[PDB]
Structure formats: C-alpha cells, structure tokens
Design a binder for this molecule. Structure first.
Ligand SMILES: [Mg+2]
Ligand SMILES: [Mg+2]
Ligand SMILES: [Mg+2]
Ligand SMILES: [Mg+2]
Lengths: 557, 22, 488, 139, 136, 137
C-alpha cells in the first residue's frame, strides 16, 4: 500500500496547479490526436519551483501513479560518474530507454546540481553535462512523445539557456496554500489516524499561518506523539508489554494540537527562531488607546479580508514608534510578538552589517524573502538610527556601504503590496537621525508618539509589575503615583526592584537570626517601610532637555 | 579516469576611514 | 566500560526525547500502527561544544541492539570525481539492506554549507545527493538519522524540514543540579576522601559544562598525585602498596583546582588574577556592602526572587574624580566574587573594518550570558557611549552604530537571566541618556573624596603589609590631608 | 608541520590527517606534535574558504568522537592562542595550556650556562653580571 | 547624493548624459531647495559637498545649447532658500506662482474605484479646504 | 549554434569548426549563422577552463583565416551586448554590429504561426496585432 502512494486525492491546496500539470502530462500521452487537431504542439519540458515541502515531489508521485505510462526516475547528482566520460552516455541511454520502451515520463530532481548558471562555475564537466542535456532535449521530434518533469527548489540559480523558447516552456510557481487549502491538506493527512471528537479544524487552519505542505504534517505527528506520551505516564504503560485495552482507548484531542502549535514553528523561519518571552496585553500597563489602535490595525487584514477588499484605502503596512527611553516601546513589541497569533521576526539594527562586500544586502534580501515565505509576518526593526541614518550625518565615509544598505531597504520595502502581508514596526529613541526617505508616505505611514505616562497610566503601570508579586493587604499605591511627576516605566521598575531587594535582605537576615538562635518566612509580603526605603533613593531618568526636544518634534509634526 | 579539484581564491572587504573637519 | 544512560546525566529531558524516538518505534511498533501515523525519524542535536552530544550518540549506540553506522563529516569526500555521492549512496544502501538501523552523522556543518554561499560544485553535489537520499523517491524504510552540530544556523534550510530533520533538540548548559549529576557520574569510579563535598562544589561552579567538570575532577586528581609523590622518592622502578592505597582526594584539592580552571568557552578572554581583597579597599564600607549584597543575592538566593516573582537589578555605574578607587573595586570583584569576570577596556573593541566592532561586542556579550552568572566590566564607558549626533565629522557614525548595538543587545528581546554590567567613568557628562536609564544601569554610585576616617582606613589598608615604627601614628596624617585622594 | 598537510586535490588533506592518526595509533603508544596550529584552525567561522573548514572538522572528529584516542598524546605549539577555534581549547581535545613566557634573571643565567658550556671561556669571565644587565631577552 | 566622493557629482553627470541621450526630455527636479543651495553656505558640511553639487548642476545646465532641447522643471515649498545662482537668467528664469477646482478634480480622481454613498457631495470639502494639498 | 559545438572527443570542437569553415569555403560564397555566441565566447576573463580557451582560439584563427577567394560572411546573434570577447570584436572579424531595438510585423508573425490550425470564422487578427504592444516572437 505504501508503494501505491495516492493520486490526485493526496495533494491538496493547489487545484489550479495540479489541474495544469495533469493537463500537460496525461492528455498528450494518452491521446495526442486532439493536440494535432487543434493545431498546437504540446511542450516537451515543464519546470516546477517554489519553497521546499510545498509538494513538488508529491506532484511527481501523483503524476507517476495516476497515469499508468512507463516511468524512469533519474536524479541530478547521480548522473555523472568517476570513469572518463560516462555521464553523457548515461543521459544518452536514459533518453534511449525513454524513447524505445513507450511514451514514458522522465523526472529530474534538484536540477541545481546540474545547472550552476554558467557564471559561478570554473570546471569543465558541468559544461559537458549542460551542453549534452541541451542538445538531447532540443533534439526531440514531435513523434517522440516523451515529457520531462523538472523539480528545482530555487529557480533563479538555473542556466538561462533552459528558459529559452522550446526548452522547459512551462513553469509553475507552486506557492503556499491558503486557509482552505491548509484545512483540506490537514483533512487529507489526518483521515487515516483516529481523531477525538473535540476538534475544530477550522480554528487550526485559521491559526496555522506560515506552515506549508509538510510542516502541518509535522504538527499532526507532534500532537500524536504528545498524546502517546501523556498516556504512557498515567497508566504506567511498561515497555515490556502492550495492553490491547489501552490501544482502543487512544484519541488525539484539540489540546494535543495546541501543545504541538506551542512547540512547532514554520520551517522557513526555523533558522531565525527567537527565544520565547511571555508578555500579555494586560501586562503592558497604560497606553490603552495606543494598544487598542495597534491591535485593531494589525487585526483587520487578518480577520476581515472581505472588509479590506470592500474598500479603496491602501493598507499602510509600516509603523514607527518614537519617544523617550524606558516608556515601553520594546515592551509593546514583545507583547505583539507573544500574543498576536502571527509570525514574528525580531532583528537588532546593526546585526545585519558585515565587513565583506555585498553580504549585507544579501542578508537584507534573504530576510525579506523569509518574511515573504511565512506570510503573514511582522518584521520588527530595532533602532533604525543604525540602518536609516541620515546620509549626511557624518562627513567621513565608511566605504559607502550605508547608502547601499539604505537603498536596499527602500527597494525591498517599496516592492511590497497587500500580498505577503508584512507589517514593519519601527522603534527609535532619537527621531532626528532617521532618514526622511523612510518616513515618506507609503513606506512608513503611521507615526505613533509614546508619551510619558499620566497619573492613571502610571498607577496602571505600577499595578502591572505587581501582578505576580505577593503583596501585603495594607498598601495604597495612589500616593506613590501622585508623588511622582516626571517618572517613566523604567523608574517604576527600579522602585519595585529596590523594594524587592530590601524585602529579600530582611528575609535573609531573619532566616540567619533564626538559624543562629536554633510562620517560616517572617516577610511573606512587601511593606510600606520597604517602599519608603526604595523611594528614598528612587529618581527620574529622562531630563527636561530631552522632554523639550521630544515636545518640539511632536509639535513640528 | 577523471578527477575533481577544490578552489577558494579570495573575496573583497570594505574598510572604514575617519575624517577631520575645519 | 560501556557508557549507558546513567553516565549521560544532566540532560534528562532531551535524553527522554531521543530515547523515545529511538526505542518506541523499535520496541513496540504496534502502538504506532494503532494511532495510525508513522513516527518521526529525523532529529538534529545542537549546542555548544562539550555539552555531551557525542556522548549521547555513544550512549545510543551502546544501548540499542540495532545496527549502527558512524560517519565523520569530511571523511566521506574523496579525490576521484563523483566519489562522495557514491559513498553516500553506498552508506545508505548498507544501512537499509541489513536491518533497521541508526545512522549517525557527526559534524554536519562540513557537509551542508547552505548550498547557496558555497562556490564549489562538489559541495552542491554532495548536498543534493544527501537531500535526495534523506527525502525523495524511496527515501527511507525504518532507519533513523541523527546529526551533530555546533552551529545550527550554518545548515541548509531544506535539511531542516519535516521528514529530513523534524525535531531539533537543544543540548544546552546544565543547571546546578545537572552539574551535581555530572560530578556524581565522574566521581563514582574513584577513591575519595570522606571530606569531599560534591554539592557545594557543584554550587560554586557557575559556567562549567560537561567536559569542564571532567577537567576539574582530573585537575584535582593530578594535584593529589603531585601532593603525595613528593614525600615519596622518585621510585623509577615500582611503587609501594602503602602509597598506592589510601590516596584520597581532599576537598582542598578541589578548591585548588577550582582556583585555576576556568570555563572552556571563556578561555578566549581569560584575565590574569590580580590579588585584591575587601580589606585592601579602605573606606567605602557602605558602597562595599551594597555592591556585595547586590551581586551575591541573585546567585545564592534565587528561591526568594521567585517567591516575590520579580527580577533583580543588573547594572551599576561608578562616577567620580579620578583615582578614587573605582578600578580597585573592579579588581576586588574580579578576584574574590564568585561570579565570572570579563574585564574589558573601553576602546579595545573598536576595529577598522565595517561592522566588526558590533560583531565583537555581540560575541563578548554572548560569551558573558552563556556562562552566566557573569560580571562585565566596562572601564571608561564614556569612550564607547558618546552623545549620539554630537560629532559632525565621523567614520559614517561608527560610534553611533556601536552605542546602538550595545543598547539594543544588552536590553532587547533576550533572556536576560544573569548578566551584571559594571561601568567606571570619571566623566559622566559624556554618557548617552539612554545608558543611564533604569534597567540598563540602575545604580548610579558617586565615589566622593575620602573623609578623615576614610583617609585613615585607606592609609591602614595601604600599610597593611609593610613594617612600621611602633611610635608611628596615622591620625595626624589624616588631620593634615583634607583635599587629598587615594592616589595622593 | 602546519601547512604540510594541504594539497590541491579535493579531499586529500583530511585524508592525509586520517592516515597520520591511523599510523600513529597503529604503530605504538605515540605522541603527536602539531606545530603552528594557527594555519589549521582559523576558528572555522570568520574564514571564508572551504578546505580549511573541512580540515578543522576532520581534526576535531579525530581528536574526539567514537573510539577517540587509545594511548596517544597530542602536543601543540602556537604563537598566538586567541586565534584558534574554541572547540579545540576544551578538555578532551587540549586539556591544558601551558604559558611559556619570559624567563627571569635566574632563567637567563641558566640559559647562559647551558649555551656557553660548549664554548671556551677565559678565566676572567663571569656570567652573573651578564644575566643582570640582560633584561628582556627571550632565550 | 552618493556617500562615495566624486560619485555624487558623477550621478548628476550621468543623469544629464541620460537626459541628453533621449532628446527631447523633461527633467523634473523635485524639492529644488536641497540642490539649489548657496555654494559653501553652511560652515559645517561634508567637505563642502553642497558647493560641488551646485557647481556640477550649474556647469551641466549652462552647457545646453538650442540642440538637445532639454527642459528642467523645479518645485519647492520654501522659495527663500533656493540659490540665486540657480535663479539667474540664462539657466532658469521663469517663476510660476501657484486650487479649488484642482482639489475637486483630485478628490474625484482619488474616489474612482471606491463605493461612495450616493447622497454625498464633495463640493463642501472643496469649499471648506482652501490651502490644502492632495496628500492631506 | 553556441553550445552545440561540444563533443565527447577531446578537441572535436576545433575539428567541427574547421569542418564547417572548409565546407563553407568549398561549396559556394555563402553565409554562416552563429547563434548564441555567448556560450562559445565566455569573455575569456571570467572563465577558468582550457578547452573553452582552445575553442575560442580556434574560432579566432578561423575567422581571421578567410581570404579574398572565400567570399563568405558570418552572422552572429547574441542576447547581452556585454558578455563578448573584445578579441572577437577586434578589427578583422566583427566590426559592423546592428542595434535591433511593430504592429505590422506582429500581424505577419500571427499569420505565420496561426495559419496551421482550424482557427475560426469570425476572427480579425488586425485587432490582435493592434492591442498587443510589447510582445515579440
Ligand atoms: Mg521533494
Ligand atoms: Mg524598548
Ligand atoms: Mg562530541
Ligand atoms: Mg582607576
């Protein structure tokens, strides 16, 4: 049954692409009379490209199974050999077998091993193999009736001679599926295995965002493994034997898929995986209207696409936060990264720059390609005062790389649209040093100013760090807020940390006294005396000159 | 019989200079 | 002899994950037919060197009774044209043909250099052959592949896909309990003195990982050998039984070995151990106590912080007139405080190339947070922390990018477990306002001129190792100097 | 020797290292001296070539792995220790790094006595003054 | 404005070469204020780059004869800070001072592919907004 | 054509070039079409092979070795005008280049291509030639 695989019912989420491939491969191979009647000669080569795991090899198995026509598998790196001049003979005999036996189908996987573009290559055997393949493919008459199936992971590293008319005329961009396609594929893979009743695959498809083809299969497998793991502990399932009664009592529930989702990530973003930071929207005290506006602006393209279509306003993808230090811009970014239900790639500003020539722009292009692959995504740019510096900030030149990287960022952000769904969040401390080219409309439209907290916002912030902290019943925080005027969230954090340190010192002193003399903890809660001792040394961070500069900038906008 | 060969020649780097104003 | 699952302690979670993947589909396959789907078959172990990944591979090879193949990374390649791919095919064919088997690919970084930055055709052909073998037409039939790496980011993304390498296990630095299991594993097959106390020793180790612990044990043993082979003669021929027996390893041996050995990761930036003590610093008693408590509280009492559920303060910046004793405090912290010390000068990290300053800063902070808890000393912080935009003529804002890298890297979307930054500057006006922000450098300590009793304390500290006249008194000297500093 | 292993053919340097180590283990309990290791260890991360990475990986595997080292001791010499891959400066590969630094007055006198032994000195020659006035000589 | 020295002026040189190659053409210089600046006006600059940019622009515009019939179009918000060396006769002498009907046409062209309410007139927005612009 | 000159035999490309040149000199005063010259001429600076240099030297010594009694010309097509050897653009071989930078030709190409099919009875290819602007070939 495994060798049988599955025909059209295996591959899902790409109706148009599969229909096109079947049209090209079956009709001119079963009955070529209709193509002669209409008067078009069907092509002899078809290219497939796209990200890995989209289903190309699956496409090859489906065409091999659905059509009973003879097949002959060859692969790129297994054609050449050690003896002098046998790759050409190998390809020649391959084509001879393809012609002599029947109107067969030939499938070459990973052409990149054979087409190095003829520009980044120095040896001669590759030239021989490329020219041999070119002449063998070109020298195919109408009566040959043999088709080749090509499978490349990256299409731009192809010898352009193969893109010429008459060679591999039909390309097919097998892209990422949509919500319906992803749900369909989930159904396809999970139908053999048992599934518990309490399951809503619609939610799983609305939450599955960057996964493509195989990653969802990984999700399913991981959930199943989790189910197997939880049932082994509780029943004391011993490795020595298996109880049949346990076997029939096996069902993967929705919680398994939730756990798998919490542990799995899209394959494309696997390299750029970030450490997990647990921030919630109630943890970010204050900034209520700003938080509501950001979440609403990010939620509309992902929840009401019909509403987005039924309109004409261009969705402004970018946004830039600016304000004084320690107000919570990075905290808002953390909260978005944790609790938005979408992809997120965090980058620090200067990391991308490299000493070598070209690598920097290569990094910008590959990162934005990863952003495009795992659509939707949220690319968080830290400290644009390192990338988007004013071309004239410094008279001295650092090699001209700064202009090149800035131009690379503009060309890769101006080459966007509604598709691929990528919202770029900016966050800078000094708004004067960013290039105005970036703040042009259509590139970075929204400009949110994160001001110093007010009395209610400050009280909310103070309550936000004391959520998990055990606290003495007799404490009132309104006085603390009223007494602080120019403080920031960082100052409040410093106050709370000082209070915690004083409490810990008292606890350790009391424990040492107890051990010397010999409730367990004399200080289970923080005290007003501790708060008084912390605010005896507390003080504000941002100066009045900085406040003046930010107010002047705000009024200028 | 044929044989292969490895080759890695060099690359290109970029330097940074400091200027003085007046 | 054989290294089983009881010699690979300290990675219980990952050990269970890999034991499950290797055993459950090879002990009770019926369960995987009952659930309906096939099990995972590709797993990638990654982590810093010496954490025990190769040890884990050895344990799996020793325990499982199935067929096992071992492949060193570069060994597969050969001189004849198209011989590497033939070797990969032969290896996979042998693995499949004989029985269900475990392949082990050691040092995968040598084989998959992303197939995009490389320019050799042989590399691209070996990568394509591996990709085809591990996933493709007739890819695998009940054989699992494990690979080991130190730099998972230097691997081609196509290899990091489900079906080829589905799960990546993170073999990271062990915790204190992990160090305890490692010590018990390595100190169970030796003769030790009764005085030995392994728990305190594991507690006092702060960044040592695996082979580091083994090195510590070896050093202790070697010192014991160099403690009892001195009383006995050279004995070129043979050793008497009375010394061969009753050797014993005292705890002092372990303390001595701890005073020399350092984490393998931080061996790059080891600093010579200058000898200072708390009594060497005259005056500044309250600053001494505040610094001592602010450093030792997170590292000795973590339960109380989790009881209150709040993170500690990290940064501190000394500022004051030159020579008040800031570098002396830094030296004392470096020499006696238990946390690791990375002493770096101000302008040391700058470089003429483009971006190498920020790369070096990132490397330094990565090492600092790797062997946490760690203390980082930034001497003359005003050299690296300049007021952004103050200089019209600059090397394309090299200072601006450096300060931005420092700010974002020391506080961003990181883990921020235990890194304590110490700053020492005598001109605090040149510092950027963001650096002074709480949560980056929360404690701004001013070191004023010494008072009369503090000048007396300094004089006593500086005369602590010199013979003095019995009739000499230092109170007059203190009464006479009023504007002096420690240097004077 | 350090650069002695490199060859033009693809896949021959690491083969030479393998042959060296296998011969060393096949012959007797041996000692392996690698001089000027800075040419076979450029940290494998800042370098851009390909053969250097392969030799570094081969050396790392040979140093430690499966059936790592049966009665063989490895000695290395370098002029700058910071420019070597951290994976080599670990226990099991290079357990201990000895710092052979500048000798002192007594060391300088010892070196002078060692070298002047084969030469014919006069009866008026003293070596203490020479070792005193000699300050920064590395031997 | 290229960071590399010399390249900055070479950009304007090959821009005017591309202009003179495809004759006739229109070179719309947006935001003239920057390029049209007094030579060495700012004491602090990147080695007086402004002066070299203005000199390249002046010496690559004054060399235009009756042949090649190029035409430079400028636009600015602040006309105070433009260089009188670029407002000279023989290079660029015209001064067009620059409505309600254009605002109504802009509002009607922006609302083409938009489901507007039928009971709505845009003449009120045209009459209320006087000194506005198309971006706002 | 360009990449149709390689053969298993070592140096056969020079023998094929000599065979073609001697056939064109033997038969009649004629014209040779060398399509896709960017494969034969790899610009000689970015390449690293040796049989490509040998076949480029053979094409150089065969294009130069045409006397007055040959009376043959050569035509060569290329895609990019930058990846050509200056030794091939030297005085003697290639000096007269053309720069091929409409609706009537598009209608002619349509009537050439689509005249071998059972098309329709209510088609006007003038509208298809007019509304199609940038297509070629
Ligand atoms: Mg595939
Ligand atoms: Mg922030
Ligand atoms: Mg290992
Ligand atoms: Mg000092």
């Amino acid at each position: 049954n495994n060798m049988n695989e599955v025909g059209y019912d295996d591959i899902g989420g790409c109706r148009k692409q599969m229909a096109q491939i079947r049209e090209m491969v079956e009709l001119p191979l079963r009955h070529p009379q209709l193509f002669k009647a209409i008067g078009i000669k069907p092509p002899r080569g078809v290219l497939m490209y796209g990200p890995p795991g989209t289903g190309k090899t699956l496409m090859a198995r489906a065409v091999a199974n659905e059509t009973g026509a003879f097949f002959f598998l060859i692969n790129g790196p297994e054609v050449m050999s050690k003896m002098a001049g046998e790759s050409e003979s190998n390809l020649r005999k391959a084509f001879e077998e393809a012609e002599k036996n029947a109107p067969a189908i030939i499938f070459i996987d990973e052409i990149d091993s054979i087409a190095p573009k003829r520009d980044k290559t120095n040896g001669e055997v590759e030239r021989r193999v490329v020219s041999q393949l070119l002449t063998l493919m070109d020298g195919m008459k109408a009566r040959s009736n043999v088709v080749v199936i090509a499978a490349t992971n990256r299409p731009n590293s192809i010898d352009p001679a193969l893109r010429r008319f008459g060679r591999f005329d039909r390309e097919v961009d097998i892209g990422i599926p949509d919500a319906t396609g992803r749900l369909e594929v989930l159904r396809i893979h999970t139908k053999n295995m048992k599934l518990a009743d309490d399951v809503d695959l619609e939610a799983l498809a609305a939450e599955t965002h960057g996964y493509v083809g195989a990653d969802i299969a990984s999700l399913c497998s991981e959930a199943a493994m989790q189910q197997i793991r939880e049932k082994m502990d509780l029943i004391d399932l011993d490795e020595d034997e298996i109880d049949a009664e346990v076997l029939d009592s096996l069902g993967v529930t929705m919680d398994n898929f939730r756990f798998a989702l919490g542990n799995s990530n899209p394959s494309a973003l696997r390299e750029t995986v970030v450490e997990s930071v647990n921030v919630t929207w109630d943890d970010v005290g204050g900034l209520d209207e700003i938080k509501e506006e950001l979440k609403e602006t990010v939620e509309y393209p992902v929840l009401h696409p019909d509403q987005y279509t039924k309109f004409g306003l261009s969705p402004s993808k970018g946004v830039l936060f600016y304000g004084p230090p320690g107000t919570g811009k990075t905290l808002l970014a953390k909260a978005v990264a944790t609790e938005v239900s979408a992809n997120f790639i965090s980058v620090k500003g200067p990391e991308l720059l490299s000493m070598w020539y070209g690598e920097s722009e290569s990094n910008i292009r590959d990162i934005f390609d990863k952003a495009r692959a795992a659509a939707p995504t949220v690319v968080f740019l830290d400290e644009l005062d390192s990338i988007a510096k004013a071309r004239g900030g410094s008279l001295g030149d650092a090699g001209g790389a700064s202009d090149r990287v800035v131009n690379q960022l503009l060309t890769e952000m101006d080459g966007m649209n509604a598709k691929k769904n990528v919202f770029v969040i900016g966050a800078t401390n000094r708004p004067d040093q960013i290039d105005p080219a970036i703040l042009r409309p259509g590139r970075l439209d929204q400009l949110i100013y994160v001001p110093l907290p007010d009395e209610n916002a400050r009280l909310s912030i103070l309550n936000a760090q004391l959520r998990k902290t055990p606290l003495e019943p007799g404490l009132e925080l309104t006085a603390i807020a009223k007494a602080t005027q120019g403080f920031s969230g960082a100052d409040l954090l410093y106050i709370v940390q000082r209070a915690a340190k004083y409490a810990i010192k008292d606890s350790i002193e009391a424990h040492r006294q107890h051990e010397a003399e010999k409730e367990v903890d004399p200080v289970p809660y923080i005290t007003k005396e501790h708060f008084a001792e912390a605010m005896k040394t507390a003080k504000r961070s941002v100066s009045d000159a900085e406040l003046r500069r930010y107010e002047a900038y705000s009024q200028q906008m | 019989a044929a044989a292969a060969a490895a080759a890695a020649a060099a690359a290109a780097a970029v330097a940074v200079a400091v200027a003085v104003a007046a």
